[PDB]
Every structure is written in structure tokens, then in C-alpha cells.
Amino acid sequence: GAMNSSNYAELFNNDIKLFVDDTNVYRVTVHKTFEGNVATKAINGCIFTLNPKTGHLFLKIIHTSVWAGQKRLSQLAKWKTAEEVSALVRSLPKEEQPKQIIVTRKAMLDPLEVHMLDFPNIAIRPTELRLPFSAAMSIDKLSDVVMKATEPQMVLFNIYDDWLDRISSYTAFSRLTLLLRALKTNEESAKMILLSDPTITIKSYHLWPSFTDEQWITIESQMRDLILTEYGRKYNV
């Protein structure tokens, strides 16, 4: 059934699973036309498909050409997402295919279920967690690859960098969601926190800076400060 705080450790057991987030698939800018009407212009998007135990991110880039001549794009985007996830599963060896796929929005359930009818043994599940994966386009290297794409493309990342050498996947996922929640709250403050120290760099093969363990504790504390300070200004608490 649904995924929530009661069954949170299930994410880090040894059953292969993937989160699918579709919130950055269909992206637009809204603008005025010369006649003073309003129109949209699509920009490149991405499907965020993440193995929370290993950190493996299957970033399918959605090039704006996929929308050409199509109607009802917000509806199509859900079915295009489900088509690409289904294609990903079919491309994997049987022993690498997921046993469950968790969608971050309930509107993805029927499109993915229908695309996965050939896989009756893969559970398609919703979640009650409010996960901040929409903020993935605030990670500069991910945004860069999406905006530079001239054609459909899949790019593979590890969103945990090398963290699992030193911490568990529960801790790594907790760090990731804290970082993304912060970026979603105040992107500028969050990024200022992450980079303020010029001697801590992001390796070419990494997404985040090379913090020591002691430095991550400080960073995580500062991200918690930034989120609960804003929760209080926002709700006068």
C-alpha cells in the first residue's frame, strides 16, 4: 500500500526499489504575446528516478521536441513518464529490475500501472511522505545537463557521491532530503551555506562538496536552522 513514516526503513532493505518523481517532466515559462495574450513556452525537463538504497539516479532528460503538436501536455507528461520508466525497467536484467516502484504523486499511479501490466510482480505504490525531489533542478550539475540537451537522453548519476563509503543509506537519504528541502525553501541561502567556504570543492565526478564528517554535521545543522527559521517566520511560530 502507501509509504509513510511507519514503514520508512523499508526503503533501505535489500528489495530493489525506485522512487519516480514527475514534477520536472513538463516545465514552461509563461509570457505575453504581441497581441497581449498569454502563451507558454516549454523548456527541457527530466524524470527523477532514484534507487534510495544505492543512490543511483536514472535521469531521463525530456527534450521539448516531445511536446510538439501534442495536446493536453500536463496529462501527456504523466503517460510519457510512465512510458520511459517502463522502458527503463525492460532495459535492465531481470535480477536488477525493481520489486516496487514508489511514485511521489498519486496521479502517476494509473499511468504507471497501465504501462507495467507486463510486470504483474512489480508493485506500484504511492507515498504519504512530502519528498522534496522537485528541488533536483537546484543541483547545478543536474540543471546544466537538462538545459544543454538537444535530444532525448538518459544520464546516470550517484546522488550520494561517495557518502556510502562512510555512512548508511538511511543516513545518506536523510542528508539528501534535508539538502533538497533546504534548497526548496530558500535556494539562495541553501547554496550560500554549501559553498561559503572556498577551500571545500565539488569534485568533477561529484554533485556536492567534499565535506568531512565534522563539516557535514555543521552543514546539516545549518540546513535545519534555515528550514525551521523560515517555518517560524512563515507561520508566525
Name the site residues for other proteins (rule: CB under 8 A). 76, 79, 82-83, 110-111, 113-115, 117-118
- Taking the complex as a whole, the smallest distance from the CB of residue 108 to other proteins amounts, in Å, to 13
For 71, residues 6+ apart whose C-beta sits below 8 A from its C-beta are none
Q: Which is nearer to other proteins, 78 or 181 (CB)?
A: 78
- Taking the complex as a whole, the smallest distance from the CB of residue 121 to other proteins amounts, in Å, to 14
Question: Does residue 20 sit in helix, strand or coil?
Answer: strand
Q: Which is nearer to other proteins, 55 or 111 (CB)?
A: 111
Instruction: Report d(CA 80, CA 62) in Å as an integer.
Output: 9
Q: Which is nearer to other proteins, 109 or 200 (CB)?
A: 109
Q: Which is nearer to other proteins, 71 or 94 (CB)?
A: 71
Question: Does residue 208 sit in helix, strand or coil?
Answer: coil
Closest CA to 82 of 104, 105, 56, 110: 110
- Taking the complex as a whole, the smallest distance from the CB of residue 120 to other proteins amounts, in Å, to 10
- Taking the complex as a whole, the smallest distance from the CB of residue 80 to other proteins amounts, in Å, to 9
Q: Which is nearer to other proteins, 113 or 230 (CB)?
A: 113
Instruction: Report d(CA 66, CA 40) in Å as an integer.
Output: 15
Helix axes 169-185, 213-235, angle to 10 degrees: 40
- Taking the complex as a whole, the smallest distance from the CB of residue 47 to other proteins amounts, in Å, to 16
